[PDB]
Amino acid sequence: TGLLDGKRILVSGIITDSSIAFHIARVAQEQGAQLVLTGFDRLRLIQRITDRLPAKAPLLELDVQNEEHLASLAGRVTEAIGAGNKLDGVVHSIGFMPQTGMGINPFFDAPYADVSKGIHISAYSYASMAKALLPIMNPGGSIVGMDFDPSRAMPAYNWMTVAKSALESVNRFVAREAGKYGVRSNLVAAGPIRTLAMSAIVGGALGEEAGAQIQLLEEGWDQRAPIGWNMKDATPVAKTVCALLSDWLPATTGDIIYADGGAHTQLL
Template identity: 45%
Template sequence: MGILDGKTILVAGVTMNTSIAYSVARIAAEQGAKVVVSNFGRAMSLTNRVIQKLDPVPPLIEVDVTDPEHLASLPDRLSEHVDHLDGVVHSIAYANPETAFADGFLTTEWADVAQSLQVSAYSLASLTMACKPLFSDSASVVGLDFDNQVSWPVYGWMGVSKSTLQSVSRYLARYLGPEGVRVNLVAAGPLDTLAKRAIPGSETFNEVWADRAPLGWDTKDYDAAGKAVVALLSDWFPRTTGEIVHVDGGMHSTGA
C-alpha cells in the first residue's frame, strides 16, 4: 500500500524528466495515486514524449493558466479521466529571460512583470479555483517555490513573483481551510531543471548551496523535493496548511 492509495492528483507543469514535477508524477503513481498531468502549447509534444516513461502513462491535458477558457473548461476536461481530485500540484513559473532576470530589475517593463506575476503566482489561485469543483471533502494543493526571504543575485522579478506566490498560498490556506483544502509550498534548492537553465547566471546558486547547505546539495536530486510534495499530498499532514517546507539541504537556516 502507498500513502496516496485511491487518490487522484493533477500535476500541472510537467515538461522534462529532469524536473520536480516529473518526479512528483512518478512517485505519486508509485504510491498508489491516479495521476493526470498538464502542460500547454508547444510544450505538449515534449511532455507527451516524457510521460511515456511513466507506468502507467498518465492522461495529458492542455492547461494554459493565462487562458480563462482553459480554466473554465478544466473540470469538464478532467472529468473525462477522473471523477474527483484529491490534490493539485502547481509547478508553473515564467519570467522573460531577456528582461526580468540578471541586472534588468530596475528597468523591466510592467508588461513583463505582470506576465511573471500572473504565470508564477496568481495562477496558484486561478488553477486551484478552476479545480475546486472536483475537490473531495478534503484536498491538498502544493506549489513549488524557491524561498525568497532575501534578495538573490540574477533572480530579479522572479524573486518578487516567488514572494507573491508565498503570500497567495497563505491567503488560499486562509479562505479554503474551512472547506477542508490544505495549501502548502515546497521550497527546493537549485536544481538543474529547464527552468533554471533559462536564468542567466544561475550557476551562482550552485556555488552558494555547495558552500553553505549543512546537508550538502545535489543539483540533480529531483526526488528529494518530489517526495516532500507527495508527503504533503497524502493524509500524513492533515492539519498543516499555509506552510513552506524547505527541501534545500538546510541552506535557508544558515547565515554567512
C-alpha cells in the first residue's frame, strides 16, 4: 500500500507532538510520503519535536509574515527535494490570534491591529503560501488548510471565527488559481483537538465564564457526533487530511471536508 506513495508534501505548522500538522505528517510517512516541513520562531524546538517521526526529513524556516521566506521558499524546497523535482501536496496548518481577540476579552475590545495580525496569519497566508508553492507543484496536486466551522457563531472563539470565515473564502479563490496548475485546494474543518493552541485559549481564560461555556461547547461535539468525537485523538483528522492529499478525492476543490464525527450535521 502507501496512500501517499512516493508523493512529496511540504507539511507546515508543527510546534509539538500533538500539533495537528504532526499527526498529518506521521500518517503521511506511515504512508510513503516524503516531507519537507516548515516551522515558525523556535525552529530548534520544532526541530527537536520533528525528530520523533518515522523517517527523517528537511525543515525550513517559515514566518508567513515576511516575504523573503515567501520569496525564497520554492528555491529552498526544490533545494530540499532536488531541482527537476516538484511538490505533490501542501499542508497549510498554521493559524494565530492575539489573546485580545479571544476567550474572555470582550469581542468589542479587540483592536484592528491585532485582528489584522491573526487574519494575516490564519487566512491570507493560505494565499501567500499558494502563490509561492504552486509554481512547483505537479498536475494532480493537492493543497489543504485547516478549518473550524466558522459558519455559526459560538462563545470564546470570537475573532478567530472571523478569520476562519475569511479562510473559507480564500480557499475558494485559491482553488481558482490552483486549477490552472491542475491543483486541488481544500480545508478540513476539524472538530476540537487538544493542542498547544487549544490550551492557549482554554488556559488564557481559565476561571471566568469560560473554563465552562467552552467546556459545554467541548462536550457539545461528542454529544452531537453520531459516531462520537474524542478530542484526545488527532489521527482521524490526519487521515482525513491524508485522504485529500491522496488521489482518492480527485473531483473535489474550493471545498471543506468536515472531520468532526458528524457533529456539524446534528443539532443535538
